[PDB]
Amino acid sequence: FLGFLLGVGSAIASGVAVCKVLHLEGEVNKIKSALLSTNKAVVSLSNGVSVLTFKVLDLKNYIDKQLLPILNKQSCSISNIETVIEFQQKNNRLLEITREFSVNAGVTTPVSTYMLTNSELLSLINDMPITNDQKKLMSNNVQIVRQQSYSIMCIIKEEVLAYVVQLPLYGVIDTPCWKLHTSPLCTTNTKEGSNICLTRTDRGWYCDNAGSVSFFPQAETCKVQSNRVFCDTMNSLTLPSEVNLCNVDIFNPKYDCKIMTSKTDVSSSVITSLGAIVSCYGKTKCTASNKNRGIIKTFSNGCDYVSNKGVDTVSVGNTLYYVNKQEGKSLYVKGEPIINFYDPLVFPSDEFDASISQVNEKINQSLAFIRKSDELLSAIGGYIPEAPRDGQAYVRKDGEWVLLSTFL
Amino acid sequence: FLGFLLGVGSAIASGVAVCKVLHLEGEVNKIKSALLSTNKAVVSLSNGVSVLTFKVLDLKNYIDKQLLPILNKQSCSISNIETVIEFQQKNNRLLEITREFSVNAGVTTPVSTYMLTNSELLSLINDMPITNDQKKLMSNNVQIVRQQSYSIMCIIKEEVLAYVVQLPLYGVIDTPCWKLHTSPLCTTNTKEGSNICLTRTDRGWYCDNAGSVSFFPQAETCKVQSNRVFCDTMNSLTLPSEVNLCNVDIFNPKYDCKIMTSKTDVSSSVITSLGAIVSCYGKTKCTASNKNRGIIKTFSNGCDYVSNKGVDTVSVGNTLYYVNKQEGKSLYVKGEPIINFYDPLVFPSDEFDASISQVNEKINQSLAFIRKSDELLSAIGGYIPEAPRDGQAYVRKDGEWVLLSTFL
Amino acid sequence: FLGFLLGVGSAIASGVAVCKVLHLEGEVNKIKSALLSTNKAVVSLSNGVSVLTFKVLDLKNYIDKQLLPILNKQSCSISNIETVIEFQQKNNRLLEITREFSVNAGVTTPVSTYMLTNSELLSLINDMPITNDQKKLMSNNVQIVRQQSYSIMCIIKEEVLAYVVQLPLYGVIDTPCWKLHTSPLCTTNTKEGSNICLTRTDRGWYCDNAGSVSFFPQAETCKVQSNRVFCDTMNSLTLPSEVNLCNVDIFNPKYDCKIMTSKTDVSSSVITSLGAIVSCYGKTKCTASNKNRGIIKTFSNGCDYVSNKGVDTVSVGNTLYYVNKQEGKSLYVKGEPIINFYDPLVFPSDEFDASISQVNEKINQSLAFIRKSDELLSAIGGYIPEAPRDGQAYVRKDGEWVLLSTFL
């Protein structure tokens, strides 16, 4: 997983900036006056930013108008059990908001329904300065919008309790996306530790964006609604479009594909959108099973795939996987496993964060060392040994030493 | 941690399949008719699967029978504060379920008490098609059962709100399990960066399963109730029984034990079930302390262990650890640290995901390079230099060049 | 991230020990008698430890005194809707506590307001045996105190429901702390895979402690309140004060600085306390933008920094970052990138967990191999070839073979 290559952002930096602006002199008074005749108004702050403002609850009006006209002539005993229940209903939302901020140090995510109800959030979306396409998208996926939102508590002063809700802006919409699943690719030997293995490390989500590809390695931060993928660019890497070349040809020179190497051959499975990848190695028993037929395929050693049509269960060793039953078409693309091409003797087998070119370079260096030693070893054989040390001169006749006296 | 070698499953694939089945024509009507005279019945769906069905709340009956017979002759004013409170009590569970699904995008885990109360869950367990041993286990550990369960919201139609609760099936029960704790094993030199270090990377939970060993590297996904271990096989690797040989002899050839190598000697501690492992290196002050006696042992450099009997606190540097006070017997198995056997000059010191054999192979390659260079260097010494270039012939007498004229 | 070098502790070991002590004979009776005339008392347990004890709710008194004096002469019908509401209010806290422990298997964190209200927690802090400085710190940061606390459920017997709240002790206070941010440092070549890269791996929080430095690699476990940093020592490494030398001179010999090497040049940004680090490589478009001026700087390839004064947004590729607007002074320290000093031919480019000395050693070994081969290659050139094999003797005149017959 390429998550260690991601950057480090500040999630609520924009919201905290609005909180700090709200503490300036007259800012809270501006909001209070703006929210006098309505629950929703647009306010321009001192820094020139126009922000939508909501008044979701008026406890000041409910306590001063209804309640608190009890004629406290030692009695105060003006009451109806209805207004006791009604006050509990109104006050409960404040209590729940206070509870949530107490356990989350003033910052919460996702934004709960107490922090913003569905009707308030939908109204907020309707009045946001965004495209009707973006309004439609946010309205149809309110639950995802909540999950990608923060609630930061700003200020409580001048009879006003204010917190900022920091909503997402989906500036990239309806571009094609694809998901890459990778599984280890070892040699199929039955013995332990006698295998060389390789694995593509670029698994995750890919989406077209501004002529590039936004790549999300930690696919667990991306939420999928049917055919739609919701992702945060703060958890993304920007890559050239040629990164898709690693799917048609891993040995292409236009992009250096990312792999890792190992000697541990362990069996596992990866459940994909429309099928399952099975990596079977050693003596592990890997099978594909059906709910009405039982075991219908026994995988051999190596890397194999089976579609979800006709298969409901894949078992790898003692681990049983349910495959997704999503509708779609699957295609098997035949090819020789690339691990077959590598000589195990000069194979770099502990490359944790490597690439196709980097592995090829290391193999080249190892072979260059072998050739250099062999060239030196061969060139040495062309020289002549020492003549016998016996007090008499020697001469070189053909390839051996003969006494000089023979030729005198 | 060997968690990167784990597979990728789909947790709620089976539950989502049941949701999709529930959307077929007549499926909801079948459930509604089945739950007419009872709150609990077994229903066979269109795909041949029999699923238990619960009706946990009947708001239709409470709103149409009680309430809503108010004679709305402009009044509708038939009411009793009791039925107002009663309706709030009945409606609150629906509100809480709606709240939870709103913030979790329709999938929740653990299953809350609002989603399934204890009595309903226990009744569900009682009627599940499982062994009485499994029923007893789930009933005694309801809190763990909740933690290993998902609640997926399926459908709301035909006056029916339906969600599937996906419960665990414990098919492996009462097999022996053991936990492996590992700590870095460096050399004891006082200087910085002048040490070679090794660490076993196979720490986690191990359990016997179907003649193999299910290995859970991320032990934080396993919940322990006294002597029982609850684990998910989807987060497991299947290994041969010979993996236990790494505990009796790390150099055994029947299994290639997993280690990692480093040159960073840093002090730390690992709290085990019945004791503490202390790795003390450099000039760190590592001590074992008692609550009634104070410091009772000062560890020397290296790797040491102390049992929890008589020891309540271990301090390593500025970090203070409380040891577990669980009752049990501990055994110290004496032996020479294996890091002593390795020559630092040819020691591969950045093997992140390696093994005993792999490290031995790299050492062999480094020594082979040394021997090959020495053999070439020694063989070269057996040859003869160039005779002086002075215009006169030279002959080889013993090991030196003498003029040919001397012998004529 | 150096989190894999951290130890393994047991968070609630001390609390579980108190739970086990509470199960001894007479311990619950001692607590019940102590909490007879007050809600808060100090109790000495059988093991000699004095623990503060709170009675936060008395359902026994409210059910037996008020309520339950209903004269059940077939009626029991003594009731007032007030005491129905009052009983719901009192009973709700027990229900919420039971709910939380049901979904968390008896251990919760942070301690919720149902488990301990603010007034009870503040009273608990006031009576803890700690310094007035520590009491002031905990009281001012109650939300952080909750986040660093566990609630363990002990026992329910003898009409007593008891759980232990395990509160933090801040024994190190007001020592200076600093945060280290690191970003990859590659060469600036435009081509892909033609770059060597280096990155400091010691990022995190550092704090002075007992003449050493407590280092927290996973900075996400440290909570910052303005200028204060709250950290857990169980997630810390103890280092010599010379670790700060890596910030003034990464090549100092007194401490071996931690780095990692790579050949993947990818653009990213790191948002710091008062600015942003931008690593721009390849053909990525990296810009610094202002909310009132737009793009005000276009970064060139390499590693650069910009302060938060005058800059509100940094965009790296398709990723947009908001910088923190915290007030403070920033300083740019000019220097040549150290990656320029490394020869790519002998550069170890897959050092995942390495150091400055370790990388230098590997470069030295690679250069030693080159020199050793060159010395052997040069020494071989000083020897003499084989004289022609033609049946006649040859003699060495100057540097060539001449017939012996010429000199006879």
Next chain:
Amino acid sequence: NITEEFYQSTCSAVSKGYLSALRTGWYTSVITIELSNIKENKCNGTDAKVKLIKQELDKYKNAVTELQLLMQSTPATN
């Protein structure tokens, strides 16, 4: 019960004596709540009890419609 052995040679420890409970499968059950289809909130009532009933019924209606709007997005975890 639980026993532990420390190996000084490899700086490791093994804690034996535990019993297994491994999740090997999934059992799915359908939990239902019967709902009431109501449309006529018509009531010319100013009584506070009537207002409370109206508020709680609106809460019920909002919950049902919110669940339906959730249902227009098919379930999927990622």
Next chain:
Amino acid sequence: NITEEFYQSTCSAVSKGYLSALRTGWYTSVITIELSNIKENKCNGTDAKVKLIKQELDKYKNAVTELQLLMQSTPATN
């Protein structure tokens, strides 16, 4: 809709046919609750309704003061 291709050579699979929704920016809105400044809880009332009102008002006051005590610590996530 969704299509998938498995590459046997590299032991990998690609699932195509998805549509994007990428969070590229942040929009910040201010949500307010108007509060009442109350100090006089003076009431010589023993009526149970009065006691319930007093309890709910104390809850409100405690919530407001707790939020203020939270506010004396400026927001920051880490």
Next chain:
Amino acid sequence: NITEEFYQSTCSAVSKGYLSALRTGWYTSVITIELSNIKENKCNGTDAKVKLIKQELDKYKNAVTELQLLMQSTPATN
């Protein structure tokens, strides 16, 4: 207060000026709730107030028994 220095040579930054609060120990306190041992829910009452009291008492009893069933499993985090 807070100052920051960027080192161009090593592509790193240090933010100084913070103050420490390090968790070095644990203090354990016992929080108790006094419970009532009730068995006789006998009441031949059809009054709605009586039914509400019975429901809230059953909730209390269920909570107590559920906590006891939790207690038959000793606490342990993993």
